[PDB]
Every structure is written in structure tokens, then in C-alpha cells.
């Protein structure tokens, strides 16, 4: 009926990490290779995602309990979950009015046609957009959004994990925090937890379709030379 | 006393390749990650050099005889000589008045201090600039510049080469073309050939100092993630 201190500290420190790793002004987007509108958009989107992977890594290191995992598991978790966390964190810029990601003026307004020009087909972009509207309709609190990102990042069901008991425990405490939070702090949220956990199963399916379409890019040297090294390392198969 | 047809065709096709691979307007420089003035300049210069490596590869494929080498030797030659050809082709933008590379306004005017901000010390930049002024003072004709770049690219004394007899032959024909050209086509050039071949020994020394300072960058993941994949492949050790 009332969150413990430890459950409050997990929220406090998770909300702080997202505030440090997510610029609402999107001003760093001018350091990327510019967008062009043969795959004209791939260099900008590669840069954008590569920057985002750096931000996700920063979030991760501050999730209570993550830093104490072994370097192998931290990388295993990051490598499998990075795109899901990016899809998740991108909802903050998604807009229902135009069905795009508005991170700037005409330049960094990312329509669905722009991500096609980066090598991805509609079979990925069709579910991803609908995922974004359904996530947007949830009108998640900041605490929930953040909690959901950290719950995603702490899934034991990922290729590579070894200590899937101890990260299972970390994910359990966070799920408990999220349920406590919704129950105590969100009027009308009685159904929210179930829908949110449903969004994680959606992410798995988007994650598969992305990694399939990425594999197609990374095996064509003419496009893989447009990727950054971090992107190549994180989504690579090593 | 008069160039043969074959020696003219080698000039014609070499001059054409450089005209296709070298934009005097430097307009593609707006597709690079912008320059910033911790190594602020590394992302722009990495992009700039990576683009240049692509242009050098295009030059190479049109050097008469290069395409008929084995893929191994072509890569061996490109990998060892790329930076020398870039240093060489950069003289076209170098300016004696300001001792910089003027490829644009204030943005793409590359002072010596800017290349420091990309991880290189004066022990490389001091000889490189003096190399550029001494190359600039030669006031090479276009035919000579081009011929010199192709002679650089066809050095048999490079790590990796296998058929150093057949590329020795290709380099010999080109040296013959350059001497014929200077003797017949350049008043006062009686001494030019010797100074030019002296510039190749300079390049070897600059090449060493660069590869030494690059090795230092590529072993620090925080800077090597700012490189492009082509750069990593060409200057890497594999």
C-alpha cells in the first residue's frame, strides 16, 4: 500500500539516469552525418542509432544491480536488448499527430519513408509504428517508462546470458517496483502493468525483424561501410 | 625526343581518372560529420580521409595495368600506399599563403592546429607541411602530379606484395613516361624528375610516422569508435 525506501531509491536513481542520457532538445543531432532525402538515409540513421547505443549503455550502468554483473552478461544483455531499448526510448520523440519521430525541424523529423531509405522494409516499420502508437496511448508516467526500459534490459531470456538467476532476481525486484508504483501512484492503472509487459513481447518480435534486416545490410560491404564501429560491434555476431 | 602513342595513352587515361576522382569544389565535405573547434576534429578528418580512400581506389582501378594484378597485390599496394597518395593528392588544396588546406570557407580550411585536434602530434605535421610546400614549389603540371601518384601506388617495396616483378614493370613504364614527359614537355624541368623521386622517399618517412601515430589511436576504443570501417580496414593490421 506504500512503496518502501529501497523501491523509491530504485525509482529515483533510474529516473535520474534517464534524465542524464536523454536530451529532449536533440541538439547533438547536428554532429551526425546529415540526412539526405541507394539508401540515402543510412549514414544519418547509423549515426543516430550509434549515439543512442552510447546513451543506452549509460542508462544501463546506473540500473541498480547492473554494474555488479560480470562484463560478459552486461555485454550479452546490451547486445540483445539495445534495439528494444532504442525502440522504447524513441517513443519520447514519437508524435501521434504526424506518425513520425519529431526530433527537430524538417531535418530530424523522421517519417516512415525515411527509415525505408535506410534499408528497412515495411515488414519491420509497420509493426514498429503501431507499437509506438500503442505505447504512446498508454501515456506512461516517467517512472513507468524508465522502469519498463530497465525491465527490458534485465531479461534473462537472451542469447549469451550466463547468470540468468541473478539477473532474473534483478528483473523481479524491478517488476515489483513497477507493480507497486502503478497500484499506488497511477489512478486507472489497474490494467496498465499487464499491457506494459505485453509490450515486451511485441519488442521481441520487432527485435527479430530488425536483426533479420540488419543481417542483410551487414553482408553488403557497400552498406556496412556506412555503419559506425559501435553499431557493428553491438549488432554483430561475435 | 617525342612521346609514343602508348606513353600518351597512359597520360590521357591517368589524367582522366584524376579528373573523375578529385572534385576541386570540395562540395561533398558537407556530407561529413562536421568539424569542431579530447580530439574534437577526429570525426570530420576520419570522414574526410575515408572519402579520400574511396577516391584513391577509383584512381587505382584506372592506372593502366593495375586492374590486371591479383586482388591480393591490389590490396597490398592500396593498404601501404593510401596515406601517401592522400598526402600527395592533398597538395592540390594546399595553399602556400596560409599553410593550410583550403577546401572551403572557415569550415574546411584545415590549419595545422586542426589536425592536432585529431590525435596527431607535430612530429608528423611538421615534416608533412614542409613536404607540402616543397611539393608545391615544384609547380608540377597536372600530368606530372598524376604520374607521380601512380608511381607511388606502384611501388614494389611494400609489405604484402607478391608479384613485385610485374608491378616493378608497371612502375618502370610510368617512370619512363614521366621522364619522357619532363624532358619533352617542361622547360627548365631538367632537374624535376630527380626532385620528384626524392619526394617519394619523403613520403615513406611521413607514412611511417603516420602509421605509428594511428596505431596509438586504433588501440584506444574511445577514439577508434570515431573511425569509419573503411579507414579501419585500410590502416588496420590484418
Amino acid at each position: 500500500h506504500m512503496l518502501s525506501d529501497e523501491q523509491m531509491q530504485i525509482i529515483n536513481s533510474l529516473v535520474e539516469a534517464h534524465h542524464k542520457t536523454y536530451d529532449d532538445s536533440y541538439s547533438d543531432f547536428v554532429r551526425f552525418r546529415p540526412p539526405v532525402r541507394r539508401l540515402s538515409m543510412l549514414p544519418h540513421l547509423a549515426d543516430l542509432v550509434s549515439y543512442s547505443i552510447q546513451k543506452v549503455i549509460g542508462f544501463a550502468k546506473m540500473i541498480p544491480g547492473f554494474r555488479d554483473l560480470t562484463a560478459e552478461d552486461q555485454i550479452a544483455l546490451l547486445k540483445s536488448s539495445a534495439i528494444e531499448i532504442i525502440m522504447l526510448r524513441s517513443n519520447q520523440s514519437f508524435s501521434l499527430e504526424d506518425m513520425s519521430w519529431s526530433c527537430g525541424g524538417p531535418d530530424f523529423k523522421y517519417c516512415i519513408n525515411d527509415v525505408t531509405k535506410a534499408g528497412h522494409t515495411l515488414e519491420l516499420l509497420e509493426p514498429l509504428v503501431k507499437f509506438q502508437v500503442g505505447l504512446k496511448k498508454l501515456k506512461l508516467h516517467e517512472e513507468e517508462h524508465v522502469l519498463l526500459m530497465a525491465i527490458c534490459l534485465l531479461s534473462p531470456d537472451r542469447p549469451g546470458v550466463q547468470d540468468h538467476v541473478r539477473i532474473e532476481a534483478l528483473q523481479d525486484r524491478l517488476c515489483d517496483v513497477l507493480q507497486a508504483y502503478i497500484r499506488i501512484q497511477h489512478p486507472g492503472g489497474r490494467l496498465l502493468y499487464a499491457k506494459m509487459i505485453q509490450k515486451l513481447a511485441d519488442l521481441r518480435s520487432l527485435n527479430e525483424e530488425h536483426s533479420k534486416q540488419y543481417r542483410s545490410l551487414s553482408f553488403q560491404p557497400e552498406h556496412s561501410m556506412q555503419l559506425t564501429p559501435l553499431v557493428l560491434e553491438v549488432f554483430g555476431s561475435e | 625526343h617525342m612521346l609514343s602513342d602508348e606513353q600518351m595513352q597512359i597520360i590521357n587515361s591517368l589524367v582522366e581518372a584524376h579528373h573523375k576522382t578529385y572534385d576541386d569544389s570540395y562540395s561533398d565535405f558537407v556530407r561529413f560529420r562536421p568539424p569542431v573547434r579530447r580530439l574534437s576534429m577526429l570525426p570530420h578528418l576520419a570522414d574526410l580521409v575515408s572519402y579520400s580512400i574511396q577516391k584513391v581506389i577509383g584512381f587505382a582501378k584506372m592506372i593502366p595495368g593495375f586492374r590486371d594484378l591479383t586482388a591480393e597485390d591490389q590490396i597490398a599496394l592500396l593498404k601501404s600506399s593510401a596515406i601517401e597518395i592522400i598526402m600527395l593528392r592533398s597538395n592540390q588544396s594546399f595553399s602556400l599563403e596560409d599553410m593550410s588546406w583550403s577546401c572551403g570557407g572557415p569550415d574546411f580550411k584545415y590549419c595545422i592546429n586542426d589536425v592536432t585536434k585529431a590525435g596527431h602530434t607535430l612530429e608528423l605535421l611538421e615534416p608533412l607541411v614542409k613536404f607540402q610546400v616543397g611539393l608545391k614549389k615544384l609547380k608540377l603540371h597536372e600530368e606530372e602530379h598524376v604520374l607521380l601518384m601512380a608511381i607511388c601506388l606502384l611501388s614494389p617495396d611494400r609489405p604484402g606484395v607478391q608479384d613485385h616483378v610485374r608491378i616493378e614493370a608497371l612502375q618502370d613504364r610510368l617512370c619512363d613516361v614521366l621522364q619522357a614527359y619532363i624532358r619533352i614537355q617542361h622547360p627548365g624541368g631538367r632537374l624535376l624528375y630527380a626532385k620528384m623521386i626524392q619526394k617519394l622517399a619523403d613520403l615513406r618517412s611521413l607514412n611511417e610516422e603516420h602509421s605509428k601515430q594511428y596505431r596509438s589511436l586504433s588501440f584506444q576504443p574511445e577514439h577508434s569508435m570515431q573511425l569509419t570501417p573503411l579507414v579501419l580496414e585500410v590502416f588496420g593490421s590484418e
Binding site: Q54, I57, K61, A71, Q74, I75, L78, K79, P229, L230, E233, V234, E238 | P221, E222, S224, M225
Partner: peptide, 9 residues
Amino acid sequence: HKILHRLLQ
């Protein structure tokens, strides 16, 4: 994975 190690402090 040289780069992820470094970024993970």
C-alpha cells in the same frame, strides 16, 4: 568487443 568493454568503464 573492444568498444563495449571500454564504454562499460
